[PDB]
């Protein structure tokens, strides 16, 4: 936004949240009447509600950066439920699981998740290792590098950023590391911006 009335290059405009307006500090003109509490709005997607009682909790958060655009809902046993239908419907979802070579490469994330928990590594490290891997796995710069060592290299790339200290020898023992190979794969990815 910018004030029509005045218009001096740097627009000195204030958000008077409690009064619910976006105002021009210089002239006094209210530029917007509709204002939302962002923090309280975010609390309808992410909340204390696991029960499903909350009329406020109406949405669900997602990680575009990692999950991409995959919106899905579990078919599960509710209060009244004949197990027959839950099986039938889930059996049906199985036949409809004809996902791509990369929509099946999200199983490489399931590997990193199993490798981080085993390495006693934090959630942020996974979300960094799963990030660096999702960006370098398809790369020509990496080509036919030992696939087992490429994802182990992204675990060190994740650990370096999240300040969680882990030795190359530690990650080397965690999966299986061909020292020269997982040192070369950790450099092509490091070169990949």
């Amino acid at each position: 936004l910018t004030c029509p009335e005045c218009k001096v290059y740097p627009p000195k405009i204030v958000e008077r949240f409690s009064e619910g307006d976006v105002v021009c500090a210089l002239c006094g003109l209210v530029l917007s009447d509709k204002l939302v509490d962002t923090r309280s709005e975010w609390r309808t997607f992410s909340n204390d509600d696991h029960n499903g009682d909350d009329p406020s909790r109406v949405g669900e958060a997602s990680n575009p950066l990692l999950d991409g655009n995959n919106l899905s809902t579990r078919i599960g046993k509710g209060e009244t439920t004949d197990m027959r239908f839950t099986k039938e419907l889930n059996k049906a979802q199985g036949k409809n699981v004809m996902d791509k070579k990369d929509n099946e490469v999200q199983a490489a994330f399931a590997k990193i998740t199993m490798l981080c928990d085993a390495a006693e590594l934090p959630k942020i490290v996974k979300d960094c290792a799963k990030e660096a891997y999702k960006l370098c796995h398809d790369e020509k710069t990496l080509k036919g590098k030992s696939m087992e060592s490429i994802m182990a290299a992204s675990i060190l790339i994740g650990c370096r950023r999240a300040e969680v200290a882990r030795t190359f020898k530690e990650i080397q023992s965690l999966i299986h590391v061909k020292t020269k190979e997982f040192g070369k794969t950790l450099n092509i990815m490091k070169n990949i911006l």
Partner: protein
């Protein structure tokens, strides 16, 4: 109640189901076949360290309640179990 759970209860839970076995019996055709095996994973004594914290940088040290409250940490202590992996074999009972 908590003390009873730690000193006793905890061990009996680690011993109820405890042991898990997987048996790989062959097709009994001829070598590489006619080899029946059974592998064991066993749960022994349960050990419980005094409370500790595993910092960002490797270092695991003793965590005191004030520290726990102030750095928003969990006043937890480590659980350790003696696990034994036994292996057995038979041809085409023993």
């Amino acid at each position: 109640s908590f003390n009873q759970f730690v000193d006793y209860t905890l061990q009996d839970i680690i011993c109820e189901d405890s042991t898990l076995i997987l048996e790989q019996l062959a097709q009994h055709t001829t070598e590489s076949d006619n080899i029946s095996r059974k592998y064991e994973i066993s749960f022994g004594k349960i050990y419980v360290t005094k409370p500790m914290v595993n910092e960002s940088d490797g270092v695991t040290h003793a965590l005191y309640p004030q520290e726990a409250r102030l750095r928003n940490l969990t006043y937890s202590s480590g659980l350790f179990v003696d696990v034994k992996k036994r292996t057995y074999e038979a041809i085409d009972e023993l």
